[PDB]
Short mmCIF file of C-alpha atoms and ligand atoms in Angstrom, two decimals:
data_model
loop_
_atom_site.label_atom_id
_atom_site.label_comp_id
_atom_site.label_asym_id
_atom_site.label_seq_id
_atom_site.Cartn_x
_atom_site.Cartn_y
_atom_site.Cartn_z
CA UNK A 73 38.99 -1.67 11.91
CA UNK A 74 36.01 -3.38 10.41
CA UNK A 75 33.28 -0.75 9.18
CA UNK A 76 29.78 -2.08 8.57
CA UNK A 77 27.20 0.76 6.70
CA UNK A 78 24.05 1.53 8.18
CA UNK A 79 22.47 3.76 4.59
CA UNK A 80 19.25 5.88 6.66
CA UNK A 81 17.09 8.62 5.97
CA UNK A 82 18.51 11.66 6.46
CA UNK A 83 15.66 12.89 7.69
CA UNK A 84 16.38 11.26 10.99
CA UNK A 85 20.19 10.95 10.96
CA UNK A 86 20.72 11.98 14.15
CA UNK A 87 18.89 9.42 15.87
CA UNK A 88 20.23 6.79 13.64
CA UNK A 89 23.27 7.75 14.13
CA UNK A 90 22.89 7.84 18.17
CA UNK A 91 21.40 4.30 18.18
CA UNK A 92 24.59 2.79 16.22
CA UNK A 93 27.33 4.67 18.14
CA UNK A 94 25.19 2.82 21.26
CA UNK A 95 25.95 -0.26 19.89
CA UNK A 96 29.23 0.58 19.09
CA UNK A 97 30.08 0.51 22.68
CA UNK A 98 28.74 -3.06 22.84
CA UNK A 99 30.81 -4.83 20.19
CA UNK A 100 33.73 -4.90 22.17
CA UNK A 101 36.03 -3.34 19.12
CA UNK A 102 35.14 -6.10 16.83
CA UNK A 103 33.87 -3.86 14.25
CA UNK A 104 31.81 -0.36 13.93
CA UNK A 105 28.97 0.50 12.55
CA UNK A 106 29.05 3.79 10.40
CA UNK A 107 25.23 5.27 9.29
CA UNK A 108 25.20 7.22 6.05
CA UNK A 109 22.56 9.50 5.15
CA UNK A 110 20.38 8.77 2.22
CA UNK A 111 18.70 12.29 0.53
CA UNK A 112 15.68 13.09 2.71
CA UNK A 113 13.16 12.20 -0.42
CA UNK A 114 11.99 8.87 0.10
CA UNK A 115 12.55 8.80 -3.81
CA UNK A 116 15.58 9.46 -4.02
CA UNK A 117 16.79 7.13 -0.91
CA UNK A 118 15.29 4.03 -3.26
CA UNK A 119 17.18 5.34 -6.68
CA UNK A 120 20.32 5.58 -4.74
CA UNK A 121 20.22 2.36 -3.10
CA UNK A 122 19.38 1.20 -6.33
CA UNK A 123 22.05 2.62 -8.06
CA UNK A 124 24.83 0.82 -5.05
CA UNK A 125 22.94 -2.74 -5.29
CA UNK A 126 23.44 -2.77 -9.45
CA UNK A 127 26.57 -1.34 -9.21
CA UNK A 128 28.37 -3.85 -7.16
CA UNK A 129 28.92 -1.38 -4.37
CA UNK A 130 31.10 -4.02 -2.21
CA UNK A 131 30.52 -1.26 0.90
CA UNK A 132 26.62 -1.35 1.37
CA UNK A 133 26.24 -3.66 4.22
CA UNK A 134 22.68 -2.66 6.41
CA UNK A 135 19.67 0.08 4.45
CA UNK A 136 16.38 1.17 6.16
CA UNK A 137 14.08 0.39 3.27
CA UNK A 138 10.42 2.02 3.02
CA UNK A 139 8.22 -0.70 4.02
CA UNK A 140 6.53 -0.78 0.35
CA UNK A 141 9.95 -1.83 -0.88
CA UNK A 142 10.14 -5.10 0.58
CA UNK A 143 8.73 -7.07 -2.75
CA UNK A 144 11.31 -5.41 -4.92
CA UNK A 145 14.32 -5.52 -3.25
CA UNK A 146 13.94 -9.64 -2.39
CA UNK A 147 13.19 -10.02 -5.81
CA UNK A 148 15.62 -8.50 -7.26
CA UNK A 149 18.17 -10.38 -5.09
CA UNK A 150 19.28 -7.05 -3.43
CA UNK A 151 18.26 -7.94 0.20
CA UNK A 152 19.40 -11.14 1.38
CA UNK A 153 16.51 -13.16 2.96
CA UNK A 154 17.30 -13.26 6.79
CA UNK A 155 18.34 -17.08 6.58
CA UNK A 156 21.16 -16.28 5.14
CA UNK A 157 22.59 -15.07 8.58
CA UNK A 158 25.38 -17.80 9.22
CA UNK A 159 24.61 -17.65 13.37
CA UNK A 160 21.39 -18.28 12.34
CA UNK A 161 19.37 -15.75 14.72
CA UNK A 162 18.18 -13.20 12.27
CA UNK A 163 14.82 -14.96 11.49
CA UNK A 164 13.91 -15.62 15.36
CA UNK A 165 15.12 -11.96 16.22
CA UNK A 166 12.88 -10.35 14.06
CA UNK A 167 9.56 -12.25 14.44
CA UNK A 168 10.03 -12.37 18.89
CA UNK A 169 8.45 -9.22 20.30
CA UNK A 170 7.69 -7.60 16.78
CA UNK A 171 4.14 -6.18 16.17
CA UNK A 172 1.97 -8.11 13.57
CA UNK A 173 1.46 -5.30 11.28
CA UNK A 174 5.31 -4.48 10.77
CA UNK A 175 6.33 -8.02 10.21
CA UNK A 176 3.79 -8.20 7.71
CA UNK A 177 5.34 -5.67 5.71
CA UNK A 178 9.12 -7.61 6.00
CA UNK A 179 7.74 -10.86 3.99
CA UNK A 180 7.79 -11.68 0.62
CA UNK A 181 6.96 -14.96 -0.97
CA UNK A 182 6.46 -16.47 2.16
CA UNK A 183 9.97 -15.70 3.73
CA UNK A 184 11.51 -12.77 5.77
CA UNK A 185 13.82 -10.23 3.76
CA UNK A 186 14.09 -7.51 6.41
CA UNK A 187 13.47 -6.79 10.14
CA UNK A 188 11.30 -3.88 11.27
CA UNK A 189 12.76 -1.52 13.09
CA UNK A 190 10.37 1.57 12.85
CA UNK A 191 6.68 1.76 12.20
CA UNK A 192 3.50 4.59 11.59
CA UNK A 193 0.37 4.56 11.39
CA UNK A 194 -2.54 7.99 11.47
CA UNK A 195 -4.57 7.99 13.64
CA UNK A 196 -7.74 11.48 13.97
CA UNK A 197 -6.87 14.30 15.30
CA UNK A 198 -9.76 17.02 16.48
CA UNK A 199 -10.39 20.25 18.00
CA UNK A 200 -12.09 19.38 21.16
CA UNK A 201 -13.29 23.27 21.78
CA UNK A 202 -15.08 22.73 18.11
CA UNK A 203 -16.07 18.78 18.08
CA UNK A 204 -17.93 17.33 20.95
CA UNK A 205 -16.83 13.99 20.30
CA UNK A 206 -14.61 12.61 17.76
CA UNK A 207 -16.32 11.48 14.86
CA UNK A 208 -15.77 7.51 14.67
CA UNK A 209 -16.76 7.00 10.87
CA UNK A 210 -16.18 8.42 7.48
CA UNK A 211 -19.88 9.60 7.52
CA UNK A 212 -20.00 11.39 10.71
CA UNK A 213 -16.34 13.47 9.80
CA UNK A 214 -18.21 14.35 6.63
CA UNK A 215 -21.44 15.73 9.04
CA UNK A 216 -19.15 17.37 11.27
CA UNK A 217 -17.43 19.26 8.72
CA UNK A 218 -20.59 20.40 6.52
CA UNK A 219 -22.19 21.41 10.19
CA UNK A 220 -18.83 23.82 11.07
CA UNK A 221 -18.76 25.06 8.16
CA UNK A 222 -22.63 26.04 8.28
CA UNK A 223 -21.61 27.53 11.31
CA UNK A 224 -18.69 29.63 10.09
CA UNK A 225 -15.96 27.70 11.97
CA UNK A 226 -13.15 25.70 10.72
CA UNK A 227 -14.77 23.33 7.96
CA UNK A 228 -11.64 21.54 6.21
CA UNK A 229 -10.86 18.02 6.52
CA UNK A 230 -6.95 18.00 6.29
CA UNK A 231 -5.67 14.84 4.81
CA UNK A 232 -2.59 14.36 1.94
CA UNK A 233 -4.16 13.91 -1.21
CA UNK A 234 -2.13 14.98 -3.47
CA UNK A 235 -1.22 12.97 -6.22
CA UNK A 236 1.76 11.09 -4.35
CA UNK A 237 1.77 7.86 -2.07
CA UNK A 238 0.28 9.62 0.56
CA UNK A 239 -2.90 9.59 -1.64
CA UNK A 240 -2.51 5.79 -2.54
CA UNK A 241 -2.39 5.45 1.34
CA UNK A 242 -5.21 6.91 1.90
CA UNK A 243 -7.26 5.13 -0.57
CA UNK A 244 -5.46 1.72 0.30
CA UNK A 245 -6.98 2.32 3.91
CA UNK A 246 -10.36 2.53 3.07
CA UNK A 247 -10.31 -0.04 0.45
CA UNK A 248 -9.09 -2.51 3.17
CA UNK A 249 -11.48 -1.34 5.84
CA UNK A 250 -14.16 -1.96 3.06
CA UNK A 251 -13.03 -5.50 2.68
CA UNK A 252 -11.55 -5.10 -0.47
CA UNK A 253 -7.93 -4.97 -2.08
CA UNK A 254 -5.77 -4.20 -4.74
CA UNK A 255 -4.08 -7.38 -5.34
CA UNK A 256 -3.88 -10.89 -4.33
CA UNK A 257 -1.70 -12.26 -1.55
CA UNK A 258 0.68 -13.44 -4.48
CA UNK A 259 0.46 -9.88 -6.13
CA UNK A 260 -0.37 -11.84 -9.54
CA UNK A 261 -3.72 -10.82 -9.83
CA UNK A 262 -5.72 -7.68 -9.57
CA UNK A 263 -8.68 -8.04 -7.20
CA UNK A 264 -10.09 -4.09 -6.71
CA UNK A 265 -13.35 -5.59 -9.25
CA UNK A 266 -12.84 -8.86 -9.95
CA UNK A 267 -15.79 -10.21 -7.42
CA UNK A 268 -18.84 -8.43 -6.78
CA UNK A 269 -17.89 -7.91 -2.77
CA UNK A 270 -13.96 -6.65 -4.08
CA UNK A 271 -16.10 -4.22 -6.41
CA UNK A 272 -18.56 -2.95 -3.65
CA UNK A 273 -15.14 -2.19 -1.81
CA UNK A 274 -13.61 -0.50 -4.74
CA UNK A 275 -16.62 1.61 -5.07
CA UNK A 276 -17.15 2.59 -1.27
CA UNK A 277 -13.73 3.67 -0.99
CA UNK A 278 -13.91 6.22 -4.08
CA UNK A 279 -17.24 7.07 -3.01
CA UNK A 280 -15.56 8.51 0.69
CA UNK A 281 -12.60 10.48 -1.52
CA UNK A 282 -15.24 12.10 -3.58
CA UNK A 283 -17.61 12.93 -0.06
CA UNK A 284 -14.75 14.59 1.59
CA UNK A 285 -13.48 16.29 -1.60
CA UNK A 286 -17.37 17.42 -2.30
CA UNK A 287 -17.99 18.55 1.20
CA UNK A 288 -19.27 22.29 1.92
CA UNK A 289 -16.20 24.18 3.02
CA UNK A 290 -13.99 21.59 2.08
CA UNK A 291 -10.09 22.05 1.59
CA UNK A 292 -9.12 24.05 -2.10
CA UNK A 293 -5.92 22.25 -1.97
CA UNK A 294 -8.50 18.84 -2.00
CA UNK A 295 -11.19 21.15 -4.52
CA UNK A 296 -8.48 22.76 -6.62
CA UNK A 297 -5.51 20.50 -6.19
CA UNK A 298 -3.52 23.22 -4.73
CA UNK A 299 -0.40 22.61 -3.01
CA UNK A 300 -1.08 22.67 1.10
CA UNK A 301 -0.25 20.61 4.14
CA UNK A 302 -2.74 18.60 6.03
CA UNK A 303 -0.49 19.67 9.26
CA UNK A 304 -0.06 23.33 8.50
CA UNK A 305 -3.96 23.23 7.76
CA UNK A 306 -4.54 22.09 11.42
CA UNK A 307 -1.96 24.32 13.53
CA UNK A 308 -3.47 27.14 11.84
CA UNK A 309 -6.78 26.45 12.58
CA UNK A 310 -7.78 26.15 9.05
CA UNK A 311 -9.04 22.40 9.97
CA UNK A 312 -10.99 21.09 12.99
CA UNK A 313 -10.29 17.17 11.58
CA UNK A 314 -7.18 15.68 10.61
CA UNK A 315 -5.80 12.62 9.84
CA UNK A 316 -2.09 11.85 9.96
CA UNK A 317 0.89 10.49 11.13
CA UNK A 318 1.92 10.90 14.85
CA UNK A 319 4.45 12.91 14.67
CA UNK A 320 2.17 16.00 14.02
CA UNK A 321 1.38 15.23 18.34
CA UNK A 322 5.38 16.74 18.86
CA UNK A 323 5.46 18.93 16.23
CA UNK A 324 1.78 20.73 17.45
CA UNK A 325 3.33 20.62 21.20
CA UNK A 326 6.83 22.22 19.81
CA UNK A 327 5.22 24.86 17.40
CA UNK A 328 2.62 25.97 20.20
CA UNK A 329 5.62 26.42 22.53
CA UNK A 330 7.53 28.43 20.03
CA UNK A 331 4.01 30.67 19.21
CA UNK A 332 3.28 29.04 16.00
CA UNK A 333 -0.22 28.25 16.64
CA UNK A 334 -2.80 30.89 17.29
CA UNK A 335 -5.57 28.49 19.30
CA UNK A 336 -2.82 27.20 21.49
CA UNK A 337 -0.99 29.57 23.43
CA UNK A 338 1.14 27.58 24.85
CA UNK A 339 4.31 30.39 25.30
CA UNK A 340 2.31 32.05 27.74
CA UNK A 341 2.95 29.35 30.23
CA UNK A 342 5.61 30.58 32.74
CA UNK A 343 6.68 26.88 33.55
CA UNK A 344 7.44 26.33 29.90
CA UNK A 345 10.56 28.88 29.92
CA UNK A 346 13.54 27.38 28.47
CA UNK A 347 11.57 24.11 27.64
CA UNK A 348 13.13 25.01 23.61
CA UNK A 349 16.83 24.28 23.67
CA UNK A 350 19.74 25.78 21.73
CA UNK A 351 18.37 24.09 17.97
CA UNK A 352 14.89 25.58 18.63
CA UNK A 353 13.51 21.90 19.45
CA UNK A 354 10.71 21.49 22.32
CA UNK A 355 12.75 19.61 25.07
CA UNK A 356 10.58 19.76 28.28
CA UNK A 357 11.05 18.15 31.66
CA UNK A 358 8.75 15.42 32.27
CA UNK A 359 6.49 18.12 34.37
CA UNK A 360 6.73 20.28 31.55
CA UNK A 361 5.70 18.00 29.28
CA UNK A 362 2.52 17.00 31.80
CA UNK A 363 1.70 21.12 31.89
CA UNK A 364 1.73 21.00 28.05
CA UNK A 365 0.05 18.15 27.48
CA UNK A 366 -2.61 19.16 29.83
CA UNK A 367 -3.12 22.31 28.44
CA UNK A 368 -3.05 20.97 24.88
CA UNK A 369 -6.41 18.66 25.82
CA UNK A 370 -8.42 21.70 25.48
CA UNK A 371 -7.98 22.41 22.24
CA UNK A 372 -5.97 19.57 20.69
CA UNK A 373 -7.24 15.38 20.95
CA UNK A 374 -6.87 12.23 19.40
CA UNK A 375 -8.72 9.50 18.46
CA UNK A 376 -8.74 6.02 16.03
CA UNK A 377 -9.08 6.96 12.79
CA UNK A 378 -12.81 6.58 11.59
CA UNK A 379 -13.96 3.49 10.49
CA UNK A 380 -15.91 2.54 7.22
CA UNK A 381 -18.45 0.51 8.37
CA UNK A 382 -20.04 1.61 11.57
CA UNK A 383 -19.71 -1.94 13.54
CA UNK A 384 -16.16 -2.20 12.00
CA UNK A 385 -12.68 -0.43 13.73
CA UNK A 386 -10.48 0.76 10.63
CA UNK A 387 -7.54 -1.21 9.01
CA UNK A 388 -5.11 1.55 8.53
CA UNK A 389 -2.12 1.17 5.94
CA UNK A 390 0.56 1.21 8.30
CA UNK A 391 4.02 2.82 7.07
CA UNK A 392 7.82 2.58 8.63
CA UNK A 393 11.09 1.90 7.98
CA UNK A 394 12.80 -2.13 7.68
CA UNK A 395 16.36 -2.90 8.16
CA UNK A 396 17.88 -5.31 5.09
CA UNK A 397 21.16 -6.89 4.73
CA UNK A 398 22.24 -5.55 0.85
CA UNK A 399 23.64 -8.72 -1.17
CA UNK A 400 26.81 -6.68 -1.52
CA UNK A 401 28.10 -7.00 2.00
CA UNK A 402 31.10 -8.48 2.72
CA UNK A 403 30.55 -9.56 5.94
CA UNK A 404 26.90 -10.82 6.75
CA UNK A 405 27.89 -12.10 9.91
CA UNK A 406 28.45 -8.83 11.15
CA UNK A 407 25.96 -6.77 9.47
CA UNK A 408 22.69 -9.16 10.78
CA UNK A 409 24.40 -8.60 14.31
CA UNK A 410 24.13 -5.07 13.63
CA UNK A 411 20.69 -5.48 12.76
CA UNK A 412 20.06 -6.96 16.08
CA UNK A 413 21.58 -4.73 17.92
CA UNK A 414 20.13 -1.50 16.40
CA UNK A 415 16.45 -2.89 17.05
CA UNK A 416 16.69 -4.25 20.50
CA UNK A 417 14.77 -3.08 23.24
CA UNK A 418 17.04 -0.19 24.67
CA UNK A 419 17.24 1.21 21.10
CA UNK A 420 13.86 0.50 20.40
CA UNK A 421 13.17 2.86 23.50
CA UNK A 422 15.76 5.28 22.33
CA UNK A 423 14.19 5.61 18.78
CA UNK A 424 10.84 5.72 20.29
CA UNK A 425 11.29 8.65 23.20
CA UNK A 426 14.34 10.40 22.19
CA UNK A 427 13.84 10.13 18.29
CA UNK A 428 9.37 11.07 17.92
CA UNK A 429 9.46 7.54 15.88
CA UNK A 430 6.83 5.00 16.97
CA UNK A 431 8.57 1.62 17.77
CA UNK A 432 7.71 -2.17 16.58
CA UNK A 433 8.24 -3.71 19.92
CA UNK A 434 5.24 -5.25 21.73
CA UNK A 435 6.84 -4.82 24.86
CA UNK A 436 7.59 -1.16 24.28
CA UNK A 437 3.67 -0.40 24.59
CA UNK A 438 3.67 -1.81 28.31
CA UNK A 439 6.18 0.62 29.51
CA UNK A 440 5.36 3.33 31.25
CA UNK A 441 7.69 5.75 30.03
CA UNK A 442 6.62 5.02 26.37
CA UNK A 443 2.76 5.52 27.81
CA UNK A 444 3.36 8.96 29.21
CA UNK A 445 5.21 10.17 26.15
CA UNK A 446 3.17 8.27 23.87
CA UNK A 447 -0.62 9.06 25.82
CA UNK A 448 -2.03 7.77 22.24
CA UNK A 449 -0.24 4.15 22.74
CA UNK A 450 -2.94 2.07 22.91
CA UNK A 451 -4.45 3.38 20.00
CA UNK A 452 -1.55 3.19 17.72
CA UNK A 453 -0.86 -0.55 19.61
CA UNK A 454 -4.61 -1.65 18.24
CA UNK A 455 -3.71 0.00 14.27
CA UNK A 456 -0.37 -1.74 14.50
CA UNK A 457 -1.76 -4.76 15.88
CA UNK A 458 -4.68 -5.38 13.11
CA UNK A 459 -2.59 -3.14 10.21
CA UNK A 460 -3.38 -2.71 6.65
CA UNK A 461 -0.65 -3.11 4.55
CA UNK A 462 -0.28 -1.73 0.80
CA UNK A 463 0.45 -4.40 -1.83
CA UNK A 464 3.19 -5.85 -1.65
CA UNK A 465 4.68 -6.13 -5.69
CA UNK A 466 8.19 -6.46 -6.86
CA UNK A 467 6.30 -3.41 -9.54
CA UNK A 468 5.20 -1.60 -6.93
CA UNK A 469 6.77 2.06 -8.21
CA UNK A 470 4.76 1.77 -11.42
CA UNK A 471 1.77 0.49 -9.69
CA UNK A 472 1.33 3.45 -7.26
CA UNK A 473 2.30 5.69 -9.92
CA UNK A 474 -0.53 4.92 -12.05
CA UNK A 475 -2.92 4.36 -9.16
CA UNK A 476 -2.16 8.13 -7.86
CA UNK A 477 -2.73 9.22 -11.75
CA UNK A 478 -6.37 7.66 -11.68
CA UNK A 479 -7.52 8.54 -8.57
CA UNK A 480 -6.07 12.65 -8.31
CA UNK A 481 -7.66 14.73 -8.91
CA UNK A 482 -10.35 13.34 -6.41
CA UNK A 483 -12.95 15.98 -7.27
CA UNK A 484 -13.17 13.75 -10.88
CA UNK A 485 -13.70 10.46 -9.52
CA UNK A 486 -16.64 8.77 -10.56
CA UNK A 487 -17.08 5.83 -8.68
CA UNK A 488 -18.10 3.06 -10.56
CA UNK A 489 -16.14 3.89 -14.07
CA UNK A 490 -13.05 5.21 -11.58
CA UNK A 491 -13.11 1.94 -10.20
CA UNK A 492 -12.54 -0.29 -13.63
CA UNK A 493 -10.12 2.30 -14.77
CA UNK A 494 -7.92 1.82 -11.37
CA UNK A 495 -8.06 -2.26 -12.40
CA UNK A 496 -7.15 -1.47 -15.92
CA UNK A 497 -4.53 0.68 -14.73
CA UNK A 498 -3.42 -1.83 -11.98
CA UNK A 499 -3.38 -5.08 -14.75
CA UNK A 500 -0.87 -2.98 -16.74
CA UNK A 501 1.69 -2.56 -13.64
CA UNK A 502 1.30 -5.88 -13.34
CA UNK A 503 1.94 -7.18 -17.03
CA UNK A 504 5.35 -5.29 -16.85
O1 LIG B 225 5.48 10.20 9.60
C1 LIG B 225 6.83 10.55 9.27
C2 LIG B 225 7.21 9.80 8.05
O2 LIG B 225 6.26 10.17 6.97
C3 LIG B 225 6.64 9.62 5.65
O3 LIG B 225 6.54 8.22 5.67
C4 LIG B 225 5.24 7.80 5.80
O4 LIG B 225 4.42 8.25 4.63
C5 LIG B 225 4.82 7.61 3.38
C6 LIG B 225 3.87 8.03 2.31
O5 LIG B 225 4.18 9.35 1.92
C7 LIG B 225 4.84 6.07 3.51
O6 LIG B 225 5.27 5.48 2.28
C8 LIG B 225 5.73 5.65 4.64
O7 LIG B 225 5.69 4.18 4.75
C9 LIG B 225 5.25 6.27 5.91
O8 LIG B 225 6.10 5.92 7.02
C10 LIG B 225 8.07 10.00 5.30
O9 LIG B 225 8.40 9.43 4.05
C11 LIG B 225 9.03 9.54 6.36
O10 LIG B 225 10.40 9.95 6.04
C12 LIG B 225 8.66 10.10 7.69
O11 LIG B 225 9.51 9.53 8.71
#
């Protein structure tokens, strides 16, 4: 039988591997689709895809791609641009019912190369017992933190800033909420000081990285570059703020459950018994999963993450995962209907409720299901809606490497010199 490859994460194999034996059973024994796990390291999922596209590997047919991989991989001629699909229904598949902010990320020089398939974005998440109300700017987190601290409670602000892409994320979110960015649309020209207003954006966004890293009480991981996890900060009530991905919502619902998290007792709860299956994962009944919601709401909130300018909702750098067809396949025909299949709406719900991975379907974020596991969906459906998006650069590795080597450690920023050294820096990623 015909075998296309589906190359994934590891990270979620299992619920890549769930969605594509569900399409199996719809192709009527024309062909299967067989995932293979990529390493769990981001990095290393690129360098071995990498390593397949230049070596001629005639068995790569469909790869989840990081969604800051886009420019490199059509450039490079290793993901066919979705025209190339001989029925033709690639392109329209992937633009109906997709979110803005994820199709963004699928384009490069003005044509699809991929179709979304999963998407991220952080949003602020907040003690309630410790913060009255969520703090809906950059300025106000900073006041909230100094004023727990003063009081002896939990002062840290967790956020990844660690010299990585997390960091690069981070700043790429407030530049954009500033106005500002790093390149042009084309990604020929560097634009973080190149006009006064790109400059004044350059600046306010290193001025909030040094604020939070110059905070009273602030994280040493942030004032000593340490190593430490923004999660692990907040389920062990070292942080009252956080900003992060959503999937620190299941994992602070699961850990509670199984004890890990002193403030939320959650394994006291008699109804909860035998919620944790045989793999120690939290797999509640949908009245278990109201009871520990409910109960999480004391202690445990959301909220968008905080804005730059007052008057202005944030534009947060949205991340995710896009399916490509590799130039090596043998049979495109087959490996766009795969694509199809492994992003339409029944897998999009399976991905969304049975995998913890936010979906790019409009539709999904009408559905009431989704809502009640997802009680956050209307925030993430605004972020994904009205997305930043990191620069999109066939030299993209090199750019964020030297990016991340500027701006860490953020206690040494200076703002105004930090910000010509990030364009210098930039121009040279650029020039090759
Ligand atoms: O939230 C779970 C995912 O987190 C990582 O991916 C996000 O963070 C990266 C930066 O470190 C972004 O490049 C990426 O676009 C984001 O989605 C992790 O790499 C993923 O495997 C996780 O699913």
């Amino acid at each position: 039988g015909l075998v296309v490859s589906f190359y994934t994460p590891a990270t979620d194999g299992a619920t890549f591997t769930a969605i594509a034996q569900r399409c199996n059973q719809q192709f009527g024994g024309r062909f299967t689709i067989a995932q293979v796990s990529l390493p769990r390291s981001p990095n290393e999922q690129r360098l071995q895809l990498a390593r397949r596209l230049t070596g001629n590997d005639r068995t790569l047919d469909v790869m989840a791609l990081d969604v800051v991989w886009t420019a490199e991989f059509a450039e490079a001629g290793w993901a066919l641009p979705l025209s190339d699909d001989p029925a033709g229904l690639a392109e329209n598949d992937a633009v109906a019912d997709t979110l803005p902010g994820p199709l963004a990320t699928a384009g490069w020089n003005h044509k699809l190369y991929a179709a979304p398939v999963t998407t991220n974005t952080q949003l602020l998440w907040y003690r309630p017992d410790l913060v009255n109300s969520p703090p809906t700017d950059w300025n106000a987190m900073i006041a909230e933190a100094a004023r727990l601290h003063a009081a002896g409670e939990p002062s840290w602000i967790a956020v990844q800033a660690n010299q990585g892409e997390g960091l690069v994320v981070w700043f790429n979110t407030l530049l954009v909420s500033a106005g500002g960015s790093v390149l042009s649309e084309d990604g020929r020209h560097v634009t973080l000081t190149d006009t006064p207003a790109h400059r004044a954006a350059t600046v306010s966004a290193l001025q909030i990285l040094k604020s939070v890293a110059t905070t009273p009480g602030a994280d040493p991981s942030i004032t000593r570059t340490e190593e430490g996890s923004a999660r692990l900060a907040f389920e062990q009530g070292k942080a009252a703020l956080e900003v992060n991905w959503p999937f620190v919502f299941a994992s602070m619902l699961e850990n509670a459950v199984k004890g890990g998290v002193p403030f939320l007792p959650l394994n006291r709860i008699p109804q909860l018994a035998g919620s944790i299956n045989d793999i120690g994962t939290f797999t509640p009944s949908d009245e278990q999963f109201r009871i520990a919601y409910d109960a999480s709401q004391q202690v445990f909130g959301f909220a968008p993450y905080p804005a730059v300018a007052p008057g202005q909702p944030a534009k947060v750098t949205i991340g995710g995962l896009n399916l490509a067809v590799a130039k090596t396949t043998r049979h495109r025909a087959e490996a766009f209907e795969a694509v199809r299949c492994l992003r339409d709406q029944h897998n999009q719900r399976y991905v969304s409720l049975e995998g913890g991975l936010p979906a790019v379907r409009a539709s999904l974020y009408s559905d009431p299901q989704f809502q009640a596991k997802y009680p956050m969906h209307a925030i993430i459906r605004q972020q994904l809606t009205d997305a930043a998006v990191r620069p999109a650069t066939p030299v993209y590795q090199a750019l964020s490497i030297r990016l991340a080597a500027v701006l860490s450690p953020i206690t040494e920023i200076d703002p105004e010199s930090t910000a010509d050294e990030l364009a210098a820096q930039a121009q040279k990623a650029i020039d090759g």
